[model samples]
Target chain A: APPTLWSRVTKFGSGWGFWVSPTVFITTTHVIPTSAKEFFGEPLTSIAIHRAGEFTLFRFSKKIRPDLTGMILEEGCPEGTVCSVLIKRDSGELLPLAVRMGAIASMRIQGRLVHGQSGMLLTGANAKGMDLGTIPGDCGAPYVYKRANDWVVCGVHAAATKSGNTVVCAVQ
Target chain B: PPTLWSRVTKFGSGWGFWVSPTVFITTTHVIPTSAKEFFGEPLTSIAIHRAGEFTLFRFSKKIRPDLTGMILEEGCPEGTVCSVLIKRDSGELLPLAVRMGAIASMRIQGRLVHGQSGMLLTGANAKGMDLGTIPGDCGAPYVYKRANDWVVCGVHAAATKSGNTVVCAVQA
Candidate 1:
């Protein structure tokens, strides 16, 4: 296996490696379809990439320490896992996007033919953990996973139910 | 004061990021500048992101001419870590390594590219510089951090050695 970039940062130090602040959030690409270069201050669309600080995209490369995952959910649901998010739907109240969990299961490629690239079935997902209609903005929020120690994001809300499964992608 | 770009671009050919579920970013000039795999040359090995955790993979995806296509092979394929994913100036996909780097005003030949971007510190790591370039590595995505978000800032273009570093193709 190839050694990841983080290992190199360990090999060197600050001059090379990378860093991050814990106060950040994420969204789905489907939420917006514009490139970063298309705007100056901000674009006029329901779709927006909100940056909330002096930080304006360092746009560099470095390595991040692992034990300090700080954010993003890598391991929360290991089959039959369930987490929740405050999805305020109708009148004055926050609704819940009831989600179920399962293994990182694998499946066949969507648009592949003969000799297609097939990754070893390490994990796959029949359901990304959501099984109902979610609020509009909820399409971009991180799926909440409150562990005994702390809260970790296991998935990102994308689309809706196809057989009652809310599709989500890993919080990688 | 750091940005979200760093958080997004993880490790790939040198350093890349999770721009989307199916995409990432790196540099185009991960190639060499001399007979040198100068990972300490400041950069080389088309995949080391300075520091982080987990395994890594670097394959080229031929989008433009400066960079090319790639195939990623994890788990010590044929003794090499990642499958070769780039083509040379002569159009050949050869085995290559990715060493990581970071953002700064980049310059190809002598043009100026702005911000924190990286994918290489090429012609470095190894003492393999003649025309002063290895040219085997290319097409690493340039990713960056904003607030809590990661974005693919640009694609690397090319590079030229400077006083203490190599101005590379973080042009994307």
Candidate 2:
């Protein structure tokens, strides 16, 4: 059986945030508001920014009991590497892992290709007709892949290119 | 070619290992005795760098344990991709050693915060090992493999909080 996605992924503002540790969650900076102090009923303790504000870490004062948290892959995988993206379905139903399995089209590219700033990329299994990046609401979603017996996260959803490729911020 | 677990070892309740056939390296403060006898050999001499806080012990004879030395890269520039060697003790796993991604930057001087001078400063990632959350050893190396050589670029010395997230100090 796959792991539960509800426990690891949480709705945050207009986008999404996923748990990386028991008390810390990760999301893109733009999705978060400056006035935010509480998340999922837990009081937020602090915030940390990396990659020139492309990524943000929100820490909570209480422990979040989840079956498993995401582990990040240290380096970008090879081209055509099998991968998945966590996204919200249009039907408003969540799957066990809520992931769409695909393959990487490009590994580490110039971040300027996404938001005219720093970032990374991941394409779907089929180069054409893959709508994983078409939904604007999926920003901050994680790009994950399997490493041995562990599910490793490599990037976070940022934008979609005109060619329908997913633009992601490399996790670091 | 050997792993860090086979080469690096616990020394006198701390961390250190044999770097050469007759030379063992570690922090000077952790050495318990002046007799200079280790691995059934007479301790010949010792070298101490008070400023760097590292010690080298020379033995009378060659040791049997694997003594693989990593190529030391002195400078870690900003935005350089890196990984930290950490041991995780959870589930059914027996203190499994793993590597996590880290992005190096010079924005925060490690010496000013953690008192350990290093060429690199880094922050947490989406998942994987965050210096703040993981209880790693002090003498662990922040490394990467280049051209089939395990490159030791920095040493994990100390970690501290910056705002809400953790930033670690290393020894170059």
Candidate 3:
């Protein structure tokens, strides 16, 4: 996974980030940002992705074939969030593709990012929504999917909300 | 422990003998009367025990007291056998001490006895049974109590037994 501008430390800080397509990235933020570089880095942009896995690392160059309309303000998403990844599968042709694209579970932290101890990378809607509950410490890892001959970078880790939130927005 | 009769090629035909205590001798077989004459020869009856551990070689000569109700049985025993030792307490009175002793868990081939595959010892019941199980092999391994200064010998290995008999017992 390419290092985000915020801090590669943030990758392990509280959660993880990833790009669904070359142009789009996803992540969770305690605060909203006007530009991708403001949150992630200069070259990165946020995208909406449906699938992610636990522990895998993803880079920006991987996302391809973006899914629109499937986007929405993630339920219980914080205010001031302009564009968020669509958690649900888009209608028609996108439904089967989302079904074919199994959801990413969680990720593992490569290094310690916690205050005093190390943390792992994780993924899932929970890591993205900011509703971290008592479920357990499994979120914000990278999720990757192999498409054609190249692998696609898919989703980022999100904290779990009260409802079962399964989608995470892309990180820029 | 030192090997006593090193040159004997086979056990059933001829075997070596070693003494762990003065009155208690250890061997694949009892020392024959004719072989007793070898004690006057170059053979050294006194086995040099290591510095930390000492065995009661002679009951009277070594100030070792004789244990009552002690029976030296020939061949291996079957199932669970309990052995008791009487020891003089601090008040100088003989106290009847009871303990669950080792089981002849299995019987092995007669050749195994001579091949230096001493016997398998267990201390599931003995206080210092774990230590007694060491020294690896002995036809009659000594399981003793240091505080009480008592010992039990002639218990054979369960590996020596064959057939479907669930209980370990002597062949005869």
lDDT by residue (tens digit), candidate 1, B21-127? 23334553332335443222222433433111122323233212232223221111111111112223321112222233454566655667443332222122322
Residue-level lDDT tens digits of model 3 in A1-172:
1112111112323444434334443544322233425233434454233332222332344334243211221222222211112121112100000101222224322342211111221111122221111122224433332223433333433433333223332332
- Candidate 1 lands at a TM-score of 0.27
lDDT score of residue A83 within candidate 3: 16
Between candidates 1 and 2, the one scoring higher on TM-score is 2
By TM-score rank, best first, the candidates go 2, 1, 3
Q: Which ten residues in a row have the lowest lDDT in candidate 2 chain A?
A: A123-132
Residue pairs with backbone atoms closer than 3 Å in model 2 (clashes): A111-A119, B36-B43
CA displacement after TM-score superposition, residue A158 of candidate 3 (Å): 46
In angstroms, the error of model 3 at A154 is 42
Output the better candidate (1/3) by lDDT.
Answer: 1
Model 1, residue A23: C-alpha shift (Å) = 5.3
lDDT per residue as tens, model 2, A1-172: 1345445667777788888777667776667777976666755444333443446666565566455654553444555444445665444333111122233344333343333122222221211222212355766776565555676666666655554434554344
Q: Give the TM-score of candidate 2 (chain A).
A: 0.66
Worst 10 residues of 3 chain B by lDDT: B86-95
RMSD of every prediction: 23.2, 16.7, 25.8
* lDDT tens readout by residue for model 2, B1-172: 4444344555654556445566555544445666555556554443333324445555555573456445654524544434444322221001111232343442332443332223222222312322122323554444444544555454444443332222333333
- Model 1 misplaced regions, further than 4 Å: A1-23, A35-72, A90-92, A105-132, A135-137, B1-172
How much is the lDDT of residue A113 in candidate 3? Answer: 25
